[PDB]
Ligand binder design. Structure first.
Ligand SMILES: NC(=O)C1=CN([C@@H]2O[C@H](COP(=O)(O)OP(=O)(O)OC[C@H]3O[C@@H](n4cnc5c(N)ncnc54)[C@H](OP(=O)(O)O)[C@@H]3O)[C@@H](O)[C@H]2O)C=CC1
Ligand SMILES: CCCCCCCCCCCCCC(=O)SCCNC(=O)CCNC(=O)[C@@H](O)C(C)(C)COP(=O)(O)O
Ligand SMILES: [Zn+2]
Lengths: 208, 114, 126, 297, 86, 95, 134
């Protein structure tokens, strides 16, 4: 498996598993899962009440020092009853390492804003308000950042269509750019691409 | 059934926030018609405010009406600060849109939609 | 305390920005998609799908393209179970209907049955 | 009915309204808003233009792709009229000048060219023909405008007997020559009574006259909801505008009272609620700003 | 102006339909012999409650719940239908 | 191999032409309907049938890697020639 | 003539020979000015001044449940009892058997391909009939 296969990094896998045990036993109040992928990335799946206690810890513990918030993300998985998955990506420049802190919410449960831990988050979770509708409590200035000012709905939800519900055109009667219910001259052609054969038997789910 | 609140513990505090938001919109509407130099009246903009509040009047969940007050305050903050243009304020008034057929018969005449 | 009790039915239709025309006139369909009979694989019959009723597609006068006015025309949602799809349809106010999962029943196979002494299940060729 | 002209869609920009319109005089004040209101339903608008193509550019965002066909024409060339109308199912005439020129008098613009358009539209098989007269069109009128427009109305009626002939009184809008004439005059007040009609009301009247099969062969009178004396109307215009090119034929039409024709149907018989001038005069005359309403009769 | 059809909805297995079931096993046949040109549509279904629809002239329909009735009560409701004719 | 409808409109290699009572001819008024006049169904019929001495022939369209994928055409039927499914070149067993 | 929707053009309840009610879905829309069938009948009833008490498809199906509630229980065969009582009613009138032998209207594959208005308007079915007759 030399030329074309990605070489597995076992040292980083061992170190991230050990540090994941470390985080899981320092913070048992909030940590729900700890996992390490085959390409050696550590995910710490926590309860949403511990956004501030975990992320401060990783920012301030002498064996963590995750002083950088690389990215903050939501993922909409509608079959989960807590359909939004808030993903923090942290960088420790001291220990040259990355950690992922994942948590959950639905449309109505507010996540605590992490601006007091990382100020970097100030726009990012603001984007999570704009794209997903996840509310962040105790945010300094929570409002839309990317959508238009009269925009209704949250676009990166997966029950939101690819085109919107409204589209703009200039109207010469009212002398104004106006919004109208969307009509496409060519509908977006949905392609059903998934093969009916199983691709990865290592990821086979057990039947009912 | 035990959920985490947003601002309001029940519907009384929630209706209080709805009521303060309606007060703020009612106060803002003449300034909006002036500085955007809209071609509507203050009565008409306040009727659109009342229409947007009474559209959501069927809701019995405190968290949903908390988020509705949050989004109404975001709309008002984008209107007081001149962040909307005239176009975004007048998108509430569907002026260029043709009136939809409302009865069964004209919806039968124009097409396939229920 | 820091928790409140809401006994109400979950409804987020006022928050999702969806126009009312595409809430109370659309029929969500919750179903496991049938296996494509061009093929023997079953990996597409594993999950539940929520689709909607198809609306009018017409001919574009310029190019002949399929013009639509339906925003929910390409919206297919994927769910692990039936109850997740039903909870998601009820959460969004979509009137739905549910087809049950149709599995193939357990067949009784025997290669020796192709060569019976007295039964009609003999093969005449192989 | 042909399969390409059956209406489809929900009546938006990419829809098909089933209306194939040849709008003569689409580059004017009325043609602007008529081609706007047609192009937003998804109508095949044919715009024959006389002018520079630059002066037609504002008509281009009004419809979807291929839904406005611009083509050259000439009033004294019937071949170009046939080249414009032979595919349409409706032909709307909006050709007009407030002044007579070196090459086109009032008889050319109001008698010759509408009769030519209506005759070539009759012989090409066009289903619907709409012609726009003026409310005060009279044979014994004091102004040559109204005399030639009455003669042209009579000729259009006798050469296309199913022509919907429409009488607007005085049309106001952002590009009018009625309130913008009074705002830029800085002539007097007389016993002249006027009821001015709004341009979107006239445009909705023309489109509802296209859609109505009862409007064939009728004559409609599009008037405003309120009759004003000329003096307090002009004072209301100078009041809204924050104030303290012409010809004598224009002055003869300003001092012509808008006649009352109760036997002709109006905007309400096409389903248009006529907008009063106090709702739209601020929208028209906001540009002239560097108010108690007028009295009706 | 007159009765036009009778519709009897019932379950196959619910106990509330039991008397309705006992109405059909014994008393339907001489019912149908007495009204040979009257459509008495018996409609069994899975988990419905028993019901007696009477359709009259010009589309008018009356509705009698036959739930938990004995066969005599079903007989009396049905003969009230046959004798009323509103 | 173009021909013309009674409206004076050219018929494409597909066979598309608008009707007389179709309004959509107005798009070519003052302009032109652009058709391609090299119909491929007439051009491939000008190619002579290749006589070969084998039972199965291979065809890649000519040019090697510049043609189509190389397919194998059987030539057992003497009633019909064997046509390339990509290029349309036809072959006959000469025996 | 009232142009109606075909079975691919409407969501529509059909019941097979074993009593199983089923529903089509809309695949394409009816061409031109053609409409769904009960929409046409309901619009006619509103023009005639005897407006039927339904507006949407769910309300039609509520009426359809009112007339027989097994027409809204999809992919469900409902058991039908009472063979004894129908057989006792069948013994009343003694209709006489004719001397004509039982001949089905479809004897060969020739008569299979065209039975209704969709199959007779098919060119594929015409090619099938022309192939099996030669
Ligand atoms: N208040 C009003 O304006 C009223 C108007 N009407 C009638 O409604 C119609 C439209 O009015 P309105 O919009 O104000 O008119 P405009 O003056 O704004 O424009 C008239 C149109 O006709 C075209 N046109 C004029 N003369 C000729 C000609 N000799 N040959 C070819 N085209 C010509 C112009 O084209 P181009 O751009 O090339 O000059 C222009 O597109 C007219 O017939 C007018 O008489 C009736 C009652 C009231
Ligand atoms: C220029 C245009 C301006 C557009 C303005 C848009 C602002 C829209 C803000 C919308 C915010 C809301 O809708 S919050 C309302 C939700 N409240 C509820 O669901 C609870 C029920 N509320 C009511 O019945 C309300 O009428 C009251 C006033 C709280 C109580 O009334 P009832 O008692 O009798
Ligand atoms: Zn080849």
């Amino acid at each position: 498996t030399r030329p074309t296969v990605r070489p597995r990094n076992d040292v980083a896998h061992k170190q991230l598993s050990a540090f994941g045990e470390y985080v899981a036993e320092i913070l048992p109040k909030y940590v729900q899962q700890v996992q390490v992928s085959c390409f050696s990335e550590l995910e710490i799946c926590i309860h949403p009440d511990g956004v501030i206690p975990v992320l401060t810890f990783l920012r301030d513990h002498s064996n963590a020092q995750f002083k950088s918030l690389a990215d903050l993300t939501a993922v909409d998985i509608p079959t989960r009853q807590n359909r939004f998955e808030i993903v923090y990506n942290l960088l420790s420049l001291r220990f040259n390492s990355r950690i992922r802190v994942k948590t959950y919410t639905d449309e109505l449960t507010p996540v605590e804003s992490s601006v007091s831990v990382y100020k970097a988050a100030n726009w990012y979770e603001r984007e999570i308000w704009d794209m997903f509708g996840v509310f962040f409590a105790n945010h300094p200035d929570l409002r839309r950042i990317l959508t238009d000012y009269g925009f209704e709905g949250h676009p990166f939800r997966k029950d939101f269509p690819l085109s919107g519900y409204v589209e703009l055109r200039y109207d010469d009667e009212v002398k104004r750019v106006v919004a109208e219910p969307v009509e496409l001259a060519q509908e977006f052609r949905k392609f059903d691409l998934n093969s009916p054969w199983e691709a990865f038997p290592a990821y086979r789910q057990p039947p009912e | 059934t035990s959920v985490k609140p947003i601002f309001s513990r029940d519907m009384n505090e929630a209706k209080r926030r709805v009521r303060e938001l309606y007060r703020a919109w009612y106060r803002e509407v003449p300034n909006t018609v002036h500085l955007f130099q809209l071609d509507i009246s203050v009565k008409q903009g306040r009727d659109k405010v009342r229409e947007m509040f009474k559209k959501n009047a069927h809701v019995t969940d405190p968290r949903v009406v908390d988020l509705l007050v949050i989004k109404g305050k975001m709309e008002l903050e984008e209107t007081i600060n001149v962040w909307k243009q005239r176009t975004h304020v007048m998108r509430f008034f569907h002026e260029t849109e043709a009136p939809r057929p409302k009865d069964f018969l004209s919806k039968f005449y124009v097409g396939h939609d229920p | 305390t820091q928790l409140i009790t809401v006994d109400e039915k979950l409804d987020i239709t006022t928050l999702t920005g969806v126009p009312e025309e595409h809430i109370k006139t659309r029929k969500a369909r919750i179903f496991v998609p049938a296996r494509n009979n061009m093929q023997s694989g079953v990996n597409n019959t594993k999950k539940w799908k929520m689709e909607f009723d198809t609306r009018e597609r017409w001919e574009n006068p310029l190019m002949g393209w399929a013009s639509t006015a339906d925003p929910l025309s390409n919206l297919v949602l994927t769910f692990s179970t039936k109850e997740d799809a039903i909870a998601f349809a009820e959460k969004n106010g979509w009137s739905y209907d549910v087809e049950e999962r149709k599995v193939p029943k357990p067949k009784s196979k025997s290669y020796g049955a192709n060569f019976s002494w007295n039964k009609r299940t003999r093969v005449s060729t192989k | 009915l042909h399969h390409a002209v059956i209406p489809h869609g929900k009546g938006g920009r990419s829809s098909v309204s089933g209306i194939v319109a040849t709008v003569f005089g689409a580059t004017g004040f009325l043609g602007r808003y008529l081609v706007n209101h047609l192009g937003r339903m998804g109508s095949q608008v044919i715009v024959p233009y006389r002018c520079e193509p630059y002066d037609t550019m504002h008509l281009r965002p009004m419809g979807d792709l291929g839904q406005i066909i611009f083509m050259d024409w000439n009033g004294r060339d019937k071949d170009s009229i046939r080249r414009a109308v032979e595919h349409s199912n409706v032909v709307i005439n909006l050709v007009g000048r407030e002044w007579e020129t070196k090459n086109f008098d009032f008889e050319d613009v109001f008698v010759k060219i509408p009769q030519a358009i209506a005759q070539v539209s009759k012989e090409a098989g066009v289903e619907k023909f709409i012609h726009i007269s003026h409310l005060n069109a009279d044979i014994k009128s004091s102004s040559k405008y109204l005399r030639n427009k009455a003669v042209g109305e009579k000729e259009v009626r006798e050469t296309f007997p199913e022509a919907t002939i429409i009488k607007p009184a005085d049309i106001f809008g952002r590009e009018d020559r009625f309130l913008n004439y009074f705002a830029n005059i800085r002539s007097l007040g007389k016993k002249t009574v006027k009821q001015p009609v709004y341009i979107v009301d006239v445009t909705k009247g023309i489109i509802n006259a296209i859609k109505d099969p009862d409007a064939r062969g009728k004559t409609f009178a599009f008037v405003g909801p309120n009759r004003y004396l000329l003096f307090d109307l002009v004072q209301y215009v100078f009041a809204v505008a924050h104030r303290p090119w012409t010809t004598r034929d224009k002055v003869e039409r300003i001092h012509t009272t808008d006649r009352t024709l109760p036997h002709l149907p109006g905007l309400e018989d096409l389903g248009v609620q006529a907008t009063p001038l106090e709702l739209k005069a601020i929208e028209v005359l906001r540009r002239h700003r560097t108010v108690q309403p007028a009295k009706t009769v | 102006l007159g009765l036009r059809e009778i519709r009897i909805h019932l379950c196959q297995r619910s106990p509330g339909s039991q008397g309705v079931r006992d109405f059909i096993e014994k008393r339907y046949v001489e019912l149908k012999k007495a009204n040979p040109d009257l459509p008495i549509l018996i409609r069994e279904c899975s988990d419905v409650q028993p019901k007696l629809w009477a359709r009259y002239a010009f589309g008018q329909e009356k509705n009698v719940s036959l739930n938990n009735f004995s066969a005599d009560q079903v007989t009396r409701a049905l003969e009230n239908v046959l004798s009323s004719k509103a | 191999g173009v021909r013309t409808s009674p409206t004076g409109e050219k018929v494409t290699h597909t066979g598309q032409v608008y009707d007389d009572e179709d309004y959509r001819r107005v798009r070519f008024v003052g302009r032109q309907k652009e058709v391609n006049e090299n119909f491929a169904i007439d051009l491939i019929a000008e190619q002579p049938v290749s006589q070969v001495g084998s039972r199965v022939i291979s065809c890649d369209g000519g040019g090697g890697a510049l043609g189509h994928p190389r397919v194998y055409i059987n030539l057992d039927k003497e009633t019909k020639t064997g046509t390339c499914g990509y290029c349309g070149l036809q072959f006959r067993q000469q025996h | 003539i009232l142009p109606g929707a075909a079975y691919t053009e409407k969501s529509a309840t059909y019941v097979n020979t074993e009593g199983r009610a089923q529903q089509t879905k809309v695949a394409v829309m009816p061409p031109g000015l053609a409409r769904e069938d009960w929409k046409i009948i309901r619009a006619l009833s509103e023009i005639a001044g005897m407006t039927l008490p339904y507006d949407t498809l769910d309300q039609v199906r509520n009426r359809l449940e009112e007339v027989s509630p097994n027409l809204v229980r999809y992919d469900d065969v409902e058991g039908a009892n009472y063979f004894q009582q129908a057989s006792e009613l069948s013994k009343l009138v003694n209709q006489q058997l004719l001397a004509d032998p039982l001949v089905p209207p479809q004897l060969t594959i020739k008569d299979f391909y065209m039975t209704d208005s969709i199959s007779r308007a098919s060119q594929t079915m015409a090619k099938c009939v022309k192939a099996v007759t030669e």
